[PDB]
Nucleic acid binder design. Structure first.
Ligand SMILES: [Mg+2]
Ligand SMILES: [Mg+2]
Ligand SMILES: [Mg+2]
Ligand SMILES: [Mg+2]
Ligand SMILES: [Mg+2]
Ligand SMILES: [Mg+2]
Ligand SMILES: [Mg+2]
Lengths: 347, 129, 147
RNA sequence: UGCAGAUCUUGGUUGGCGUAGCAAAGAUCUAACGGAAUAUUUUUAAAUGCAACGUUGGAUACUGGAGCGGGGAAGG
RNA sequence: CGAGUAAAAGAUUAUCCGCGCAAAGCGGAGGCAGUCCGUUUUUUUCUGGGUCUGCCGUUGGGUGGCAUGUGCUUGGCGCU
RNA sequence: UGUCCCUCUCCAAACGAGAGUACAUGCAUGGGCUGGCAUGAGCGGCACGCUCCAUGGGGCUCGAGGGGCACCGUCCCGAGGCGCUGAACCUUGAUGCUUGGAAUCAUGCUCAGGGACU
């Protein structure tokens, strides 16, 4: 959570400080490897083809195998031997011509870099691959941008701004097989009920002679896909190796990073670029999340406000944290018994 | 209007009377501005006007329905600045339907949430908290 | 010849990085450009008869277990721990170790235990292990050893 | 002296079905021996013989004298 | 074995690629010898040199870019 | 050439199914960090006690309601208190951090993985 001053004329909280919880998401740069074009038909959109980058990393090609280490590792081998030959250049020029003539949508195939995200609890080593659409301009201009962004890295600062909003496509935390009280929120029955309380008493009338799809039943809860629009960006950070003072504010000159004391519980250190979003986000820690540019109109006063942070909390999330940095702890306690022994051994 | 605070006082609660009208406690009958919901009891928080009856005190104030305002509550609530605060007891003062105090003094502190809504109560408060 | 060790990329990048070289985490001069497992020293198979000393953190194996099953469960866990290490299915428990596990009741198993493990072969050859108890005053700065 | 049914009579067979279950009285562990019940592979050792039984020593525990103690009547 | 593309556009899809409107028109293409096949129009293949544009895999050494242990691009070695 | 089973991990999980890893700081043990509780056993009482200052030399500080032997001192029994002592212990397991910014991480085990189909 953070502290900031709110600018909102006509409100009882105007020009005062508030406390708002936030979410931290690690954002290593992505790599673009492909271009796909779509044409519109009376039955829907159909893919025209794909243009590949001729140079792919090991973590990208891991996605095509279930046991990569004990395998021949032959993916994309023939394409590499053929792409730059005279027949190879002609074939690519043919596909690009079809993109120009008969396409309405241009997208790029991109994958994350799990080697740079040096996380100990994320066990997967094969990259996550997805498609990202290019908006704006004409078809000719769209293709030019896609070709320029081939084999290169894309940073999150080039896609989003500091005080904008975004959408959060994610998958919810799982709960397994759960009953109607937790799954749907129905009332519990009186203490005297024979054969149990946590149930729906009547699941239908005599007619129609069947159970309808609108009645609550027990089953799977959680692990669903949601969208949850209109989440405001509060900060666009950079990697701790290049900018050590991540959580330092103009109103708080302490030098500290975004990682709490003792690390994020179950996750660890944030060693990469990151985004700070206001509020909550679906899913547990370590899950991969997609952020999208908004669909709803962004002309409201709440969505156009400029955010200036004042204080970022970095106390330990284990127990009741009460120190902001490690120096605060070493100033409250003086030298301890173990420090004295180390000094005595140094003598 | 005001920001929402935790409810803390369902119908049937008995709270102290903080003015000097001769009443000792108040029994909450209902809360103003409650839109119903099946099986849910109306509940009153700080700065809420309630309908109440006196169960202890001068016989002249008893056996009739009055108006009152809640000024202290034991259930903690969170302010917009992130602070959680609570009192030691629940209390209220007898008031007329317009909002003017029947008494002339108040014992104990008065919540800031109740003070801004009712200007007359702000005058007689020993302390605004 | 299916090994195909190659491994010529590590040296070519090492001499490259020596030229252009803040950059604390990328300066090779652990070792960069190689896995930790590749530096493990590979000798032949170990002899048939070996002796090892190790500690087992039992409290992390018995958390929120039913109270009156903790001593019997700790016996099966110790057998599985040693069996995977020594590749054996015959693991004798010995009286000193059995008494120590049960010496505080069925539900008061100690948090840690230090054991001595010896593997023997008898005769197709048959391998079995004998596990005994090592009483120690403190469990600090104690690490697995092979004699 | 001719059977398809009488909630027909007597035998046999049958889906349900390897299903419902076999949940009061707290509980067993270890080594050696016994046993056909093993350490059973020909197509290094673990990933190809599991699971279970009795006695003795050792450990742990229950009954707790209105006792799963020691003797009798009735009944057997 | 009962053959229908929200596909292309031609010696009946065969007998090459690029630009162009199912146009007018405008550009590019390596030579030699053998075997086995051959009812024709420089017949259909298979090798060996035969000189190679465009490529794959290298060597170090100088650059240089990317977020920085992992891939690249420029400049020469021979090389498939 | 690939997929699955046994073995390993948990964002998944009634069983199936899932996300993963395939000699990997992968697993085990230890050290630091971050937290929880609230000051361990033992010894002691103008001193090789404890603390501070510049091995040695100098400044500190050292209880107890009561009772009992042995011609006043000495020796004892005594709940509690003080010092060594923010000590001692626990800290990832149905599953907190750290071997790559600066300020910390270190050892041990792997030795042609085995099996079923296409
Ligand atoms: Mg009943
Ligand atoms: Mg917490
Ligand atoms: Mg009702
Ligand atoms: Mg008949
Ligand atoms: Mg059953
Ligand atoms: Mg008993
Ligand atoms: Mg008896």
């Amino acid at each position: 959570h953070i502290v900031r001053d709110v600018d909102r004329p006509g409100s009882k909280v105007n020009k005062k400080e508030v406390v708002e919880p936030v979410t931290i998401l690690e954002a290593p740069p992505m790599v673009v490897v492909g271009i796909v074009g779509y044409r519109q038909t009376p039955v829907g959109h159909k893919t025209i083809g794909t243009v590949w980058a001729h140079h792919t990393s090991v973590e990208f090609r891991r996605r095509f195998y279930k046991n990569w280490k004990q395998s021949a590792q032959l993916a994309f081998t023939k394409r590499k031997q053929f792409a730059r030959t005279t027949e190879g250049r002609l074939a690519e020029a043919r596909t690009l011509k079809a993109f120009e003539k008969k396409a309405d949508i241009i997208r790029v195939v991109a994958h994350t870099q799990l080697r740079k995200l040096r996380n100990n609890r994320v066990g997967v080593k094969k990259a996550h691959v997805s498609e990202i659409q290019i908006n704006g301009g004409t078809i000719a201009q769209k293709i030019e941008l896609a070709k320029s962004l081939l084999e290169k890295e894309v940073r999150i600062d080039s896609v989003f701004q500091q005080s904008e909003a975004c959408d959060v496509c994610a998958v919810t935390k799982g709960h397994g097989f759960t009953g109607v009280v937790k799954r749907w929120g129905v009332a519990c029955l009186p203490r005297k009920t024979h054969r149990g309380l946590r149930k729906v008493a009547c699941i239908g009338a005599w007619h129609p002679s069947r159970v309808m799809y609108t009645v609550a039943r027990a089953g799977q809860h959680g692990y669903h896909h949601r969208t949850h629009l209109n989440k405001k960006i509060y900060q666009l950070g950079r990697a701790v190796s290049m900018e050590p003072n991540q959580a330092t504010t103009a109103y708080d000159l302490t030098a500290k990073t975004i990682t709490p004391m003792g690390g994020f519980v179950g996750y660890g250190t944030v060693r990469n670029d990151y985004v700070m979003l206001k509020g909550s986000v679906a899913g547990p820690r370590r899950r991969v999340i997609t952020l999208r540019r908004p669909m709803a109109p962004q002309t409201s006063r709440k969505l156009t406000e400029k955010i200036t942070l004042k204080f970022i909390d970095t106390s330990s999330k284990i127990g009741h944290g009460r120190f902001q940095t490690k120096k605060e702890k070493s100033q409250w306690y003086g030298p301890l018994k173990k420090d004295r022994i180390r000094r005595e051994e140094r003598l | 209007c005001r920001f929402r605070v935790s409810l803390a006082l369902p119908v049937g609660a008995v709270v102290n009377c903080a003015d000097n009208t001769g009443a000792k406690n108040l029994y909450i009958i209902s809360v103003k501005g409650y839109h119903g919901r099946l099986n849910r009891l109306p509940a009153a928080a700080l700065g809420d006007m309630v309908m109440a009856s006196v169960k202890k005190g001068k016989p002249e104030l008893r056996r009739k329905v009055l108006n009152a305002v809640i000024i202290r509550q034991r259930k903690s609530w969170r302010r917009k600045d992130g602070t959680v605060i609570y009192f030691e007891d629940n209390a209220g003062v007898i008031v007329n339907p317009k909002g003017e105090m029947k008494g002339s003094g108040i014992a104990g502190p008065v919540a800031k949430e109740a003070a801004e809504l009712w200007p007359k109560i702000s005058t007689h408060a020993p302390a605004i908290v | 010849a299916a090994e195909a060790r190659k491994s010529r990329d590590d040296r070519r990048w090492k001499r490259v990085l020596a030229k252009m070289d803040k950059y604390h985490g990328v300066g090779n001069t652990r070792v960069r450009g190689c896995t930790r497992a590749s530096l493990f020293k590979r000798t032949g198979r170990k002899p048939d008869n070996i002796v090892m000393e190790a500690s087992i953190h039992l409290s992390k194996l018995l958390k929120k277990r039913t109270f009156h099953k903790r001593a019997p469960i700790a016996i099966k866990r110790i057998r599985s721990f040693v069996g995977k290490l020594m590749k054996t299915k015959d693991n004798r428990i010995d009286a000193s170790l059995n008494t120590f596990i049960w010496h505080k009741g069925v539900k008061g198993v100690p948090g840690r235990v230090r054991v001595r493990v010896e593997r023997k072969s008898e005769t197709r050859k048959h391998f079995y292990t004998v596990i005994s108890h090592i009483p120690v005053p403190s469990f600090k700065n104690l690490t697995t050893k092979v004699i």
